[PDB]
Write a structure and sequence with these properties.
homodimer; elongated; about 0% helix; binds calcium ion; Gingipain R2 (chains A, B); binds zinc ion
């Protein structure tokens, strides 16, 4: 839900605002991390994409006229 | 960042996947709450939009070939 993950070619693209992102390879190795978004060039194989959302609270002021 | 908030006419539209949304009026009253998104019809005045993201961790399996 609060992220997108997609693969095209060898490219894994991950988008998740205010989230810590991690990609693990099959050996459980952290091959990349980034906040918010990532474009990872992978090799053939299976990967685990981890999205850790930060769980903050935000407030916005809105004026209705 | 992990949400959008916009007022158009008397309509307040809020979008934030996996989040608890709240709108408070000027008296501090909860006038609406929803998961993930809402379309609120307001009266003239000032509103506080609160976005409480859930802070969960997600994992997706990705295959590169
Ligand atoms: Ca409350
Ligand atoms: Zn490691
Ligand atoms: Zn090593
Ligand atoms: Zn770790
Ligand atoms: Zn921080």
């Amino acid at each position: 839900k609060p992220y997108t993950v997609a693969v095209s070619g060898k490219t894994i693209t991950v988008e998740s605002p205010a989230a810590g992102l991690t990609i693990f390879d099959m050996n459980g190795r952290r091959v990349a991390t980034a906040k918010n978004r990532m474009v990872f060039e992978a090799q053939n194989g299976v990967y685990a994409v981890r999205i850790a959302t930060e769980g903050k609270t935000y407030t916005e002021k809105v004026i209705v006229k």
